[PDB]
RNA sequence: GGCACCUCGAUGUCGGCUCAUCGCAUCCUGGGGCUGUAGUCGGUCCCAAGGGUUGGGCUGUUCGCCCAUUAAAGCGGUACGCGAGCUGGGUUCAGAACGUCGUGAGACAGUUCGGUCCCUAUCCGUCGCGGGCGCAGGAAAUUUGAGAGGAGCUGUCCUUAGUACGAGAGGACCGGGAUGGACGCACCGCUGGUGUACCAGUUGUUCUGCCAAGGGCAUCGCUGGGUAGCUAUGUGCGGACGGGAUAAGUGCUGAAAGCAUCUAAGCAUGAAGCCCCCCUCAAGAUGAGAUUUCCCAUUCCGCAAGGAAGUAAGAUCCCUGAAAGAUGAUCAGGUUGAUAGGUCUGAGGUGGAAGUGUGGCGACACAUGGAGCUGACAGAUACUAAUCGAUCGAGGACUUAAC
C-alpha cells in the first residue's frame, strides 16, 4: 500500500484508446521523501511518514529542522502515515516519483472537503423544503425535534450548521495516465477538496 | 493553467479548419453499428462556442423531416474525421439560440452567404 | 428528463395525436426518463382514422426528448419536440411508420427492429 | 471578491466615481479603512487610462470621472488633469500609485480611518 | 419567548465574564510618541516609518 | 368503554406539511422446517428490526375505494408523536340560509357560504465554533484507538438451459456475467442554472454648449450571453470482496432406558441479525497515552519551604489575505519578500470599439482590425500595502526498584 499525496491544480478532460470522454483530476504528487519509518517493536505500529512540498528554512521551526536531519532532506510541510506499508518497502530517505502507480490500478482518494461555510439543513442534510405558498410561513426550517414524552431533544438530531473542511474518503477512483517526467497523476472521477488543497492518493482495497 | 496547457497539447487537433460560430459546416462521424463504421454526414448551423481547451464544444443544429436536431460536437474529439464549411454567415452575436424557434425562412435570413 | 403528467406528441401512424404520461415502469422509482424507457400512457387526443382512440391506456417507448441525452463519447442530442411510439405487450410498434429523426440510444437495447422503420438515425 | 459596503449596486458605481473625482482636486483624502482598500483598485486603473493619451481612452474617463472643475483660473476639467499633470509625473513608474496609510478609529462610530494619497 | 424565571446573579456574572473587551496592542513611536498602536498613523506627530504626513 | 385520581387562576382539538425514532404479532429481502411442495408459483409455522418501505383521482378527513406501479407498497407506540415549527380545510364563537322541531324566543354529533392561530430563548436540551486550566519541565509535530457515529436496500437482462422436471403447457435450484432504480458522499471539466463594479443591443427623458461618443434615472430600465464562486436536473464514487462466535434448522459420535436418540458429555454445519472488515469524530479514554525532533539546565530573594525578574525552543498582539470564515478559530504570509492590490503577458467571456476613409439621397453598410472592452481565473513583476516594535513563554515535585 503506497500513497504519494499531493495538491490538485485543475480539472481536465482526457481521451485515450476508446473514443469515450473521461474526466480527469490533475495531482502534483511527486516528489515525496520518507522522513521516518515506524517500527512495531518500538513505535508499536508499521507506518511511513511521507512529506510533501519542500519549503524555505525561514518558515521552518528549529525542532522541525532536526526531524528532517535524520532523513537527510530539506525541511518540508505536511506529513502523513499510510498504514499498512509492506515493510521493508524502501530504505530510509529514498525518493519516490509516481513509479509505483500504473494506469490499471484502482485507487482510493482521501482529503479535506471544500468549505461550504455555515449552512442550513437542506444543504447540510438534503431535507425537503417546506411549502412556499398556501399561506404557509414555514419553509427552510428543520422542523420539530420529535416526541414530547422524552422531554428532551434526541442526540444526533439534525440541525443547521457549518459544513465542509472535514476529511472525506472517495473510494475506488481509477488512474487514467502516468506522467513521471512532470510528476503528474491523472485519476478518473471527481476528487474532493478545494483547489490547490493537499490530497492523499492511497492504494484502494482489493479485491 | 500553464501546466494544464501542457497536458492538453498532446491531444490537440490542429488539423481542424478555423470557422466562425455562424456557418453550415458538415462534421463527419464514424458510427460503430458493428462491425462496419457508417459515415453519417450532418450539415447544420453552429451556435455555442464554449472555451476551455480540449473541453471546447460547438452545437451544430439541423432540421430533419420537419423536426430539428441538436447534436453537440466537442472541438477536439477523435471521432470527427473532416469538417467542411459549405457556407459562411454574418452574425450580430455569438449565441444564436433564437434561430431554432424561427422556422423556417426567417432562419435562412441569418444564413446569408459570405 | 420527463416528469409525471407530461404530454408527449405522437411520433407514429398509430392514429393518436397526443399522449400524456402516467408513470415510469423503472423501479419504485425513477420519475425522470431519458430515451428507451417504457412508460404507461394515456391518449389525450387522436386522429379520427386509426386503431387508437382517446382515453386508452397503452404503454409507449420514448423516441425523442427536449433534454440533452448523454453518451460516453461526450456527444449530446436534444430534439426540438418530445416524442413516443405506442406499443402493446410485444415491443413491435403499432405505428406503420415513424416520423422524424430517431435516437441511436435505442440501438444498444434489443429494440433494433424499431430502428429499421426509422427514416434516419442520429 | 469586491467589497459591497452595503450600498445599492447602482449607488456603488456613483460612490466610487465620486471618490475618483475628489482625489483629482484634493490630491489626498481621509476615509474609512475598509473603503480605502476598495478605493485603490479603481483609481489606479483610471491612471492607466491616461497613460496612452488616446482620444478613445479619454472618453473612457468620462464614463467614470464626472465633469467637475479642478484647479482655479486654469479651469481644467477633472479628466484633463490626468492627461496633463498626473500622466507626465508617472511616465516612469508602473503601478503602486496610491499608498494608503492607516489612521486611528473615528470617535463618531468607532470606524477606522485611512489616509489616501497619490505617490 | 417569555423566560420562565429571573436569572441568578451568579449566571449573570458568568455571562459577564466574556463580555469584556480586550486591550488593543500598542508600541512606542520611533520618533517621539507616546504611544502608537501597530499599523496605524499616530494622532500626535503623524509620522509614519518615518515620513511626516498629516 | 367503565371509574372521575393529573390539569377547568387555561393540558390549544382533528387531518396534513415537516422531521423522526421506538417496539414486534415481519409487507419485502436473507435463513429455514412441514405441505393437498412435479417444476413454476404458493399455503403454514418457526430465526430474524439490518435496511427498504408509492406516485395520483375522490373526500377537510383518518379510513376506504379506484388508477398506474413496485422485491413490498406491514401494523402500532411516542400527550390517538410533533401548532413557544407551519397549515385552518374539518368541528368548536359572533353573520347568513335550507329542512325539521317549538305559539314564541330559539334549537338540531343535520347540512350550506364567510370568518385576526400572539410571543425578542432564561435554564435544561440538541447542531456547530472558541476562550481557560489540567495532563508533575516547556515546545513543534506525527499518531496508537478505550469509546462513538455513519454506511447496512434491491430490480432486470446474459449464461449454465430450454438442461433437471413435466404427456404436454410451463419452466428452475445452484454457480458466474453485465446494466438500472431508490438513497448516500463528493467535484465542475463536460450538460446546464445563477451570476447587481463583465460585454453587447435598445426605449423615454435629462445631464456633458452643440455633433460624434457617453453618463444619471426608470425592477440590474428592458433584452441577449457569460468569467469566478455557488450549484443539480450534470458527472464520479459508494454499500465490495471476506472472517469470529451464533439464531431457527441440518447434523456426527453415544449414554441415562444393552436397542434407540442433535445433548445430557464431546465435536460440527448454518442467516441482509450480532461482532469486525469499509468510512468518519476521537487520550477532558483526569485511565489524560505512545513515538520523532528541539530549548536548556538562568539570573535575583528567602539558611529551609517557597516566591519573583528576564530568556531559550516556540507562540501571540498587529498587519497582507484566502483553499477558511457569523465572530473567534483554521490555513497561506509578513521585506534573503509573490500574501493581497496594481502593473505587464495569457486563458475565458462579450464579440467587429473609438477615430478615420469609402459607397449610399438618407437611414446604414463596408474597410482599416478576431478589433475593442474586460469583476473576482492564471503566469511573472516590489510598482504599492504586509512599517516600527511589543508581549506571552521552561529552571524540570517527593518516593521506591533496576542501574
Alpha-carbon gap, residue B23 to B13, rounded angstroms: 20
Q: What phi and psi, each to the nearest 5 degrees, are found at residue C99?
A: -65, 145
Closest nucleotide (C1' vs CA) to B57 is F190
DSSP B58: E
Residue A77 contacts residue A55 (beta carbons within 8 Å): yes
Listed residue (C57, C50, C54) closest to C18, CA to CA: C54
Q: What does the buried/exposed string (b/e) look like for A98-119 if buried means 16 or more CB atoms within 10 Å of the residue's CB? A: beebeeeeebbbbbbbeeeeee
Q: Quick one: resolution in A?
A: 4.8
Residue A195: Cβ-neighbour burial (10 angstroms; 0-12, 13-18, 19+): exposed
Taking Cα atoms as reference points, which of C96, C95, C115, C118 lies closest to residue C106? Answer: C115
- How many CA atoms, within 13 angstroms, populate the side-chain half-sphere of residue D17? 16
Taking contacts as CB-CB distances below 8 angstroms, the residues of chain C near B73 are 75
The C-alpha cell that represents C30 in the structure block: 425513477
Structural biology method used: cryo-EM
Q: Which residues are paired to A54 by β-bridges? A: A76
Angle at which helices D55-64 and D33-52 pack, to 10 degrees? 160
Q: Which nucleotides of F are covered by protein (CB under 7 A)?
A: 16-21, 54-55, 67-73, 77-79, 81-88, 119-131, 139-145, 149-150, 155, 180-192, 196-197, 208, 212-218, 220-221, 224-226, 228-241, 278-281, 289-295, 313-315, 317-326, 332-334, 336-337, 341-344, 346-355, 366, 370, 372-379, 383-390
Nearest-10 crossing angle of helices D55-64, D9-26: 120
In this complex, which of D101, D104, D112 lies closest to E53 when CB atoms are compared? Answer: D101
The CA distance from C13 to C52, in Å, is: 10
Burial B33-64 (b: 16+ CB within 10 A, else e): eeeeeeeeebebbbbbbeeebbbebbbbbbbb
Amino acid at each position: 500500500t503506497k500513497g504519494i499525496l499531493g495538491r490538485k491544480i485543475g480539472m481536465t478532460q482526457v481521451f485515450a484508446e476508446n473514443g469515450d470522454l473521461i474526466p480527469v483530476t490533475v495531482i502534483e504528487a511527486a516528489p515525496n521523501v520518507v522522513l521516518q519509518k515506524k517500527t512495531a517493536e518500538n513505535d508499536g505500529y508499521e507506518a511511513i511518514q511521507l512529506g510533501f512540498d519542500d519549503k524555505r528554512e525561514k518558515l521552518s521551526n528549529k525542532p522541525e529542522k532536526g526531524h528532517v536531519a535524520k532523513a537527510e532532506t530539506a525541511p518540508k510541510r505536511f506529513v502523513k502515515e499510510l498504514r499498512g506499508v509492506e515493510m521493508d518497502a524502501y530504505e530510509v530517505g529514498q525518493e519516490v516519483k509516481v513509479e509505483i502507480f500504473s494506469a490499471g490500478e484502482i485507487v482510493d482518494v482521501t482529503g479535506v472537503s471544500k468549505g461550504k461555510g455555515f449552512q442550513g439543513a437542506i444543504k447540510r442534510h438534503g431535507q425537503s423544503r417546506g411549502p412556499m405558498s398556501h399561506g404557509s410561513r414555514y419553509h427552510r426550517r428543520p422542523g420539530s425535534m420529535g416526541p414530547v414524552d422524552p422531554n428532551r431533544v434526541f442526540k444526533g438530531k439534525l440541525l443547521p450548521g457549518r459544513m465542509g473542511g472535514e476529511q472525506i474518503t472517495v473510494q475506488n477512483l481509477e488512474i487514467v495516465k502516468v506522467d513521471a517526467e512532470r510528476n503528474l497523476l491523472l485519476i478518473k472521477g471527481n476528487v474532493p477538496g478545494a483547489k490547490k488543497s493537499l490530497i492523499t492518493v492511497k492504494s484502494a482495497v482489493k479485491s | 493553467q500553464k501546466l494544464i496547457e501542457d497536458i492538453t497539447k498532446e491531444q490537440l487537433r490542429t488539423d481542424l479548419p478555423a470557422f466562425r460560430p455562424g456557418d453550415t459546416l458538415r462534421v463527419h462521424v464514424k458510427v460503430v453499428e458493428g462491425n462496419r463504421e457508417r459515415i453519417q454526414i450532418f450539415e447544420g448551423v453552429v451556435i455555442k462556442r464554449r472555451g476551455g481547451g480540449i473541453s471546447e464544444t460547438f452545437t451544430v443544429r439541423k432540421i430533419s423531416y420537419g423536426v430539428g436536431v441538436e447534436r453537440t460536437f466537442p472541438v477536439h474529439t477523435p471521432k470527427i474525421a473532416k469538417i467542411e464549411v459549405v457556407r459562411y454567415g454574418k452574425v450580430r452575436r455569438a449565441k444564436l439560440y433564437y434561430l431554432r424557434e424561427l422556422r423556417g425562412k426567417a432562419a435562412r435570413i441569418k444564413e446569408i452567404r459570405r | 428528463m420527463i416528469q409525471q403528467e407530461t404530454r408527449l406528441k405522437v411520433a407514429d401512424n398509430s392514429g393518436a395525436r397526443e399522449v400524456l404520461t402516467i408513470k415510469v415502469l423503472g423501479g419504485s422509482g425513477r420519475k425522470t426518463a431519458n430515451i428507451g424507457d417504457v412508460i404507461v400512457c394515456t391518449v389525450k387526443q387522436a386522429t379520427p382514422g386509426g386503431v387508437v382512440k382517446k382515453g386508452e391506456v397503452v404503454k409507449a417507448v420514448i423516441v425523442r426528448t427536449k433534454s440533452g441525452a448523454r453518451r460516453s463519447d461526450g456527444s449530446y442530442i436534444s430534439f426540438d419536440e418530445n416524442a413516443c411510439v405506442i406499443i402493446r405487450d410485444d415491443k413491435s410498434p403499432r405505428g406503420t411508420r415513424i416520423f422524424g429523426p430517431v435516437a441511436r440510444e435505442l440501438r444498444e437495447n434489443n429494440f433494433m427492429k424499431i430502428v429499421s422503420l426509422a427514416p434516419e438515425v442520429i | 471578491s469586491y467589497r459591497k459596503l452595503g450600498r445599492t449596486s447602482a449607488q456603488r458605481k456613483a460612490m466610487l466615481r465620486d471618490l475618483t473625482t475628489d482625489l483629482i482636486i484634493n490630491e489626498r483624502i481621509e476615509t474609512t479603512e475598509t473603503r480605502a482598500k476598495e478605493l485603490r483598485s479603481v483609481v489606479e486603473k483610471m491612471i492607466t487610462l491616461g497613460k496612452r493619451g488616446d482620444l478613445h481612452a479619454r472618453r473612457q474617463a468620462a464614463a467614470y470621472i464626472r465633469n467637475e472643475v479642478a484647479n482655479e483660473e486654469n479651469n481644467q476639467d477633472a479628466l484633463q488633469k490626468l492627461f496633463s499633470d498626473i500622466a507626465t509625473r508617472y511616465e516612469e513608474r508602473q503601478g503602486g500609485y496610491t499608498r494608503i496609510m492607516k489612521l486611528g478609529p473615528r470617535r463618531g462610530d468607532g470606524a477606522p480611518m485611512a489616509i489616501i494619497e497619490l505617490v | 419567548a417569555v423566560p420562565f424565571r429571573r436569572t441568578s446573579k451568579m449566571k449573570k456574572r458568568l455571562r459577564r465574564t466574556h463580555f469584556k473587551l480586550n486591550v488593543p496592542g500598542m508600541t512606542e513611536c520611533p520618533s517621539c510618541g507616546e504611544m502608537k498602536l501597530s499599523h496605524r498613523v499616530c494622532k500626535a506627530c503623524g509620522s509614519y516609518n518615518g515620513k511626516d504626513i498629516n
